Nucleic acid binder design. Sequence first.
RNA 1: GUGGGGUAACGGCCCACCAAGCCGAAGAUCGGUACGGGCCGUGAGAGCGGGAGCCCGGAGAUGGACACUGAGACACGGGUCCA
RNA 2: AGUGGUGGCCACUAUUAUUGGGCCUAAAGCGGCCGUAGCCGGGCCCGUAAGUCCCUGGCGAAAUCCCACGGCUCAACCGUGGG
Lengths: 129, 143, 110, 173, 93, 124, 242
Amino acid sequence: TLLDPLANALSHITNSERVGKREVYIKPASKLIGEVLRVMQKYGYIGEFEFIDDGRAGVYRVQLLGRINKAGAIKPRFPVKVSEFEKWEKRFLPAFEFGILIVSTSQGVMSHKEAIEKGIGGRLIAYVY
Amino acid sequence: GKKAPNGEFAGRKLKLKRKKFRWSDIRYKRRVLRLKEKSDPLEGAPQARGIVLEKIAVEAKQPNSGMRKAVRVQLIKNGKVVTAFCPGDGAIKFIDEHDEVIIEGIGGPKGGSMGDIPGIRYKVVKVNRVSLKELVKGRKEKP
Amino acid sequence: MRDIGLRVQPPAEKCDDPKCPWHGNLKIHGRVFEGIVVSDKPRKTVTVERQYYFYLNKYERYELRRSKIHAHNPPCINAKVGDKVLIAETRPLSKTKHFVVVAVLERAEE
Amino acid sequence: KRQRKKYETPPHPWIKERLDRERVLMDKYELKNKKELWKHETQLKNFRRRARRLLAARGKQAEIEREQLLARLKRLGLLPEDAVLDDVLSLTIEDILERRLQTIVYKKGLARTMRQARQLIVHGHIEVNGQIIRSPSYLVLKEEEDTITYARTSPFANPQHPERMMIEKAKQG
Amino acid sequence: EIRIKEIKENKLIGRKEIYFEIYHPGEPTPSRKDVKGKLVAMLDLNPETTVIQYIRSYFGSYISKGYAKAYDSKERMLYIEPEYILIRDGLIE
Amino acid sequence: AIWQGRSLKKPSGGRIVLARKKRKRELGREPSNTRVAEQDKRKIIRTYGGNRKVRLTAAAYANVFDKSGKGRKVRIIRVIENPANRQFARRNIITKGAIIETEIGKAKVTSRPGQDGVVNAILL
Amino acid sequence: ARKGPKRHLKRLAAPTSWYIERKAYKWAVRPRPGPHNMRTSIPLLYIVRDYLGYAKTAREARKILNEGKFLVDGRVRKDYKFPVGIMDVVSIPETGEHYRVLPNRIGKLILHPISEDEAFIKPLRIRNKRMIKGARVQLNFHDGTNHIVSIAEKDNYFTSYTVLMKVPEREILEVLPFEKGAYVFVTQGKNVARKGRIVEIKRFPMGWPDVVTIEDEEGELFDTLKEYAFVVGTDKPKISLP
RNA sequence: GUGGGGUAACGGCCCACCAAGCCGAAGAUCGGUACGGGCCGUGAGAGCGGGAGCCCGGAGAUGGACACUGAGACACGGGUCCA
RNA sequence: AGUGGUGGCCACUAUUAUUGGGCCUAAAGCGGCCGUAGCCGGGCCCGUAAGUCCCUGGCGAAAUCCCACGGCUCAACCGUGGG
């Protein structure tokens, strides 16, 4: 059973990247997935991404630019304050500011760097680098 | 499969699993039950005082060959009798029947028997409040 | 009607009972909690229950914890099983009773 | 509570590289024991840990602590007046050992050999800012460095002390 | 050579506290009598009403720290001051 | 000893091992048991904190009050009904709330004779 | 086990508001009961010995106190265990020196030197009001002192109002009400040793004190409890304040 | 739960009457262990182990039981009984 | 001016694995299946704001921790100020 669309999507993205496929289709096109896809695109990991009206859940189509070493979902959604970033960031980014974490906060799903700039906590949802 | 549980709200099963499989360790199990403290003839004493009962030669384990001298000692602290090695060369002459000896551990693995000598656990340190190391060296003299 | 220093509405009925917060002689002081009545067998009594999530530091996970509180049910309110109620602290009513119901925020039928 | 040693023993005592490096340092600077060297290295590690922790900290307290650390390090003379938080990781033990009382007085040419400097300091012939100090392991601040001179009542205040002309000749030679 | 660094007058008690340095380079620590006789000169005090509490010799320091008092009447020390310090200063047998 | 301390069984019914010997502040005193006789007999007991309580042991009179609020000192013929216990009224023991037959009629006691040292009742 | 009240005081457990070296000796003066709490007061002996340096030893301080040269709110206090608290006036007529005891921004007690004119006036908060036989009103203040007034005058005083008492003869001079815009000093809390103007009086149900919002001289807004707000003036403070 | 006794005082603390409640696998009762915390040792950290000089709180004065005086005691250098 | 012998705790040890262990042949998958509790759960929109995140008031004794400065010759120790 599909317990989670987001982790499956990120696993698919990484496995597609490793072989080197050009286009990736994400089957359970959820809103949180779309907000997620916006993020690393804003940071240049991917190119244009589009939604497709399939009539079941829609499908998210993305093209791969060969710039994603590994992407996954921090599953137990640990709540994190503003100061506790380096603790979790040391756990999921290979080096200092290498890659980005994604946080669901009061102001939306959005990048951990900008959250530090906004100085707002939230719940980690996924990591990619 | 994947390691479980992993949910945000499964602290209880994680803690219970860890407690359950911590007992399978032997070090922690020994410490909590204080089994050594129940089994120790020294009752936790690194050093103890006893009275020599007799002198025995024991054969070293193969392939080594040798006749290791040692003394049986009746413990003043609790009365239990234990065998203690006599270090040094020819030290057994200095030791005599009904001698107040002070023994400690021998230092084998897990505090057990050391080297090729099996079963022994302790070595004689002092005799009649004079140390065996000097007596074998001869610097001091037994009373 | 007499105000208890807490922001709810009184029960319409007036009970002669001297232990009613709105119709008795006792008073209110201390903490106020929201709970669910899960036992009403003892007379003028309820065994409210309160749930919460207690954090753990070693595992960084939450644990579900339930706390029972024996509270005094006045006859005017007459809380029953499954009713979300507001419970407040009083002087020691009994060996286990140190609380009284203030109102019934949600009845069982809803 | 009990007090604790201010120096950290090496993790393994018989590594050839560390042995030889410490031996070279010992012979050059002529300390009495490796205890002094280990104390100085522990001081170095303390400063480096403070720099590490501060470099990754954001907040007013972090800024104040950073400024204070740089101020003290400059006070010791271990850093230039335009130093930053980066080069502090590049400090070595030799920077500290150069700042020792014995090393400074010997570099001030009051001793033919730094062992003789140690004797002079011990016997109270060397005063710092007009105050004596009998610990050669004492660390000398930059400000103190110009006030280091012979003890007034000691014979070495006499220019005619028989060892004094030998000292000054070896300095000249 | 005596250099005073503080002279506090305790109007409640009626005493002048005296805190001072003594320069004795290359010399032993001066005796109580000598410092008292030197101190009384440039401050014009009565020796009987003046008492020197302590003379501490800092390690490796040729300047010694000294603390003394100078009251107004002969009864104040007897009523107030510890009996032992006068015995040290000899004002009591 | 009359020890007013913790219950030796937990709320769950688990027995408890007392951790300390009984303190002096925690002991109670004996039942006063005010009896019906022809004269007043009382003891003024020194209490904790140096204060006093006037304890009535034998009762002869009572203050009966009409609902208008006038008080009348009167005698007590006997005790009618004691809701606290069936034994008290049988043996002529007066407490608060019991009903007393006096010359005026029936009165209900709103005073605690063991504590207040007096008897006050409202006419019925 | 302990069988009665403590009488001694170990120097380590002393109130944090005292400028006392804590490891110097084992013992410290347990203050006697008095106008304030230990959290809000210090023994007078520490004032004489440490803070003022008038007496080096405790015995000299005790003798000076026996001489009766120290006036607390214009009263001789020979008890060297006498606790002196906040807004108290300490006076030395022999030196003519007048100080007020005030908290610090760190949360310790200090002596603010004042003029002679300001020594006869002590501002006292009104902690409570009560009715006493004879139909009289008893105002109970912050320092434990009490004042009696008639039933008629009752409406000129209210809880948390600040009365400028004349302690040399115990005469009321003025009443500062606890209303918006009143100038206030802070006694405790993180905002201790701050002074400003009231903006809001937030009531709260369920049993919490009225949190007051105070604007600072520079406009900074902060919050404190009603119990810590001490009205010092109407639009400017009426007493010198660090 | 009702009505009382008792207390400095609420309270089954205790009594009389009425009812059958109360806790439990989210581990009760029972058993072992042990004064608790401030802290301390160790480790890069996560964490692991001890309750120690000292501070705060508790309790004991050869074991068990009880009372007077006193604001404060069931009282280590006070009182009575049993072992 | 210390240096060895013995005993205990931590590290060594990812041989306790939340970070971060394994389970085909090395110790370890229940013989299989159903299912209660527990745990984990499809997408979109409206609502509450309990958890959550930010701000803010009281509070978490002192000593002990870390830091700068100052006193004992430096240090150990102690005071001042910050965390």
